[PDB]
Amino acid sequence: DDWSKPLPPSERLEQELFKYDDIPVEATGNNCPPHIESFSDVEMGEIIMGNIELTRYTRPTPVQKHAIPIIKEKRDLMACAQTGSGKTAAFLLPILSQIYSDGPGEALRAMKQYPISLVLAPTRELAVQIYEEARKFSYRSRVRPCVVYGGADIGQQIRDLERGCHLLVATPGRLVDMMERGKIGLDFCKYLVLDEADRMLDMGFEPQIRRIVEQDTMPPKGVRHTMMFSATFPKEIQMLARDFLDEYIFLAVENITQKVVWVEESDKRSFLLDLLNATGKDSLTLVFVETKKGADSLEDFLYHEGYACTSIHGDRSQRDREEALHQFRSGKSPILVATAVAARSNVKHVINFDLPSDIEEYVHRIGRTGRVGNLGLATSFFNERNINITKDLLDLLVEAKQEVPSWLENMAYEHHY
Amino acid sequence: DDWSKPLPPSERLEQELFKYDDIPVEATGNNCPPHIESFSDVEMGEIIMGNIELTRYTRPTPVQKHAIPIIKEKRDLMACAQTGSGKTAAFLLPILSQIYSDGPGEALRAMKQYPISLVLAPTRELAVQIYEEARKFSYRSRVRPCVVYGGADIGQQIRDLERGCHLLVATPGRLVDMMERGKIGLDFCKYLVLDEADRMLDMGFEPQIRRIVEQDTMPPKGVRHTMMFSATFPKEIQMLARDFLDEYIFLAVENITQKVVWVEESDKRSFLLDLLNATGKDSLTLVFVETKKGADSLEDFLYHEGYACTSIHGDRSQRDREEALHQFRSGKSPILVATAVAARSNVKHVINFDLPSDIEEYVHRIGRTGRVGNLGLATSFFNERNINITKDLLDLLVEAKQEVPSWLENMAYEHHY
RNA sequence: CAAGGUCAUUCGCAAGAGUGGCC
RNA sequence: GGUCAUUCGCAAGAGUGGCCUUGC
Ligand SMILES: [Cl-]
Ligand SMILES: [Cl-]
Ligand SMILES: [Cl-]
Ligand SMILES: [Cl-]
Ligand SMILES: [Cl-]
Ligand SMILES: [Cl-]
Ligand SMILES: [Cl-]
């Protein structure tokens, strides 16, 4: 009855089983656990780490970087995250990891089915999707996932439950039916997550959810560990979160024309001058560069060429920074040269004089333009010093439905394949 | 009382804690388990895999690649391996891995000290060395190693034991002393390894070893798991192995002048012709090349230049191979051109026309010369295509006390550092 | 003094390419 | 055909190193 010990392998089973808008992400709450950079930063045990290998799962998605460490400290979570941010692994990994570590508990040890974990989904296509990922992370484990949803044969689902159910995925209406039929009890449900809670509300599932969570045998908030996921955060969702969550963490996650052009290092100042000379009366331009001395040298160059500009970087005093922000937003010096210091308001044009080394700085940078309904332009200079970001920038431009330079996908092929 | 679960970390403790002759290696026995290429191919659990990370052990030494899989399948082992082959990790990792997996057993649960594992060493230099390696692999575990040796204060060792001892490292004379004093009992010793058994015999420790292993409470062979390590294998060691081991696996692991020279690809045939033209009357030369058609094209070249040579590679029939070995061994065609097919007798000169991609194939190749008391010569041609083996070949030449080309250690610096 | 990113190398993992060897 | 091993490109993890960027 050790649940941290992996079962004997099975290769037949093995082969059967085996976006960018969400990168500005902030979690706020009491003693919020800091976000991780890799699945290695949390110790989720042999089975979980094993099955992570088998999925070929590489790095944690932005939501996974913040959700996973929150879940592992058994803190409730209200997460506003969209379809495609890696929500499923974000809660399935730490929950199962804890289930392996603790085992089934003396109630189910000295023993209808009692799932230790209940995942509620609005639709059949998402319930099955969550279920399929649960089997991949429960492979070679004694934890058996099940899935239960309306619109299909209830007789076959009943037959699957009786083969054992410790993690249950379900749609609200079909789960209510299984408890009236006395096939499921929630008396030992220590983990409850609600996926796409907004859609679950939109589809009219609140009475079933309140019946599942409040009018029956499920342990209350503070005892059970609760997670809510929803793409939008209207007040209806906030009131359900205050009803269902306890001392929780709030986690929150392209009207911009993006142009990438090839510019050799010795041509960058000339290319910049041409972009500035085509800039309107009082449009503000944000010029991002790599190094503090780069920002210093470039502001002097622009001054000697007759452009009213200013500068800001990490070694600037808070006073020097305020002076630059004054001249910039008064329009007197409408060009601001900055390092990463100014990646994290109403800027019309962001120029990546130097592209950054990682795709996340690129997101933060272009996020200073094209704000709240305005039109924004982001122009980036690219050469051989930037192949380290070829593949991630190409993937981003494709997702953003931006024009992709034909030579850029050619260099992604030639370097990565 | 779960021993697979890691303890809370400890920062202070962490930084407190954190050859090439041995690579022709063969294990023979009944259903001998196959050798591994990485520590990952055997599942030694969270704690072990953890602490391997923390020591930064990257790959298994040749002895480890064969010993570890043998130990994990609970097979006795007689290993002829020298100090410096990674013996300690070879038995410490799988033994501790199993102890974590099984725990202490229901005997020690309901409870002088009873070590589950006893390591016997000839000297305190090796006892302390093994003990320090055991602490690195038992960090954050509930398994406590101890070390006990003559020549030091027995009073301090006694008080270390009663803080708990599950893995005991000891010298024979000081151990028997502890069991006469009733401080150590062997009634639960399921793992026994004897390190440098030859030296232990040389130093006169057989009566103590026979008293420890045969005349007291240690479980007999076939019940306990026994491993013997010794640098030499005289018949005295073999008789001790037949008394102490049960259905065991036998594991067995610089009179060659080695020259490395820079040869561009278009110059190799010219360089080879000069080596052949300086070859004695009835000396046999082995010329190793990379590809089968490389071997074909080179035997044709040597033929059209008037050299009696022959060839062998993987796509040659057993008949074609015997014909080539006939002309080679008779002296009629004293040059044999071969791929790796002939790396694994009385060869005077081995020429690595093409250096191999891995350092293991290199030694197997040079092992065909300088055998049975004969000064052998090994000539290797090197260029840009062989930088992948720069550091392994440089390290090997240094250990072999061979002359190192000054340009070779310079290219190791510029590529790896 | 803390964080993070990139680059070199070492190392385990997958996909891919090339080559070698075994039946 | 089927198995195995090595190397190289890339993806991702850990350490060393170098470089750079931030916070105080
Ligand atoms: Cl439903
Ligand atoms: Cl339950
Ligand atoms: Cl200031
Ligand atoms: Cl050793
Ligand atoms: Cl002694
Ligand atoms: Cl014992
Ligand atoms: Cl034949």
Numbering used by the authors:
A (entry chain B), B (entry chain A): 134 to 151, 162 to 254, 264 to 405, 413 to 503, 508 to 580
Question: What do the paper's sentences say?
Answer:
Found in all kingdoms of life, DEAD-box helicase (DDX) is the largest family of RNA helicases that regulate RNA biogenesis by unwinding short RNA duplexes. Like all DDXs, DDX3X contains a helicase core composed of two RecA-like domains (D1D2), harboring 12 highly conserved sequence motifs. DDX recognizes short double-stranded RNA (dsRNA) to form a DDX:dsRNA complex; ATP binding to the DDX:dsRNA complex unwinds the RNA duplex, resulting in a complex composed of DDX, single-stranded RNA (ssRNA), and ATP (DDX:ssRNA:ATP).
Crystal symmetry is P31 and the asymmetric unit contains two polypeptide chains (amino acid residues 134–580), two RNA strands (nucleotide residues 1–23 and 4–27, respectively), seven chloride ions, and 72 water oxygens. We show here that all four domains (NTE, D1, D2, and CTE) recognize 2ʹ-OH groups and thereby discriminate against DNA substrates. Our structure shows that two D1D2 cores jointly reach both terminal ends of a 2-turn, A-form dsRNA, explaining why DDXs, which function in a non-progressive manner, rarely unwind RNA duplexes that are longer than two helical turns.
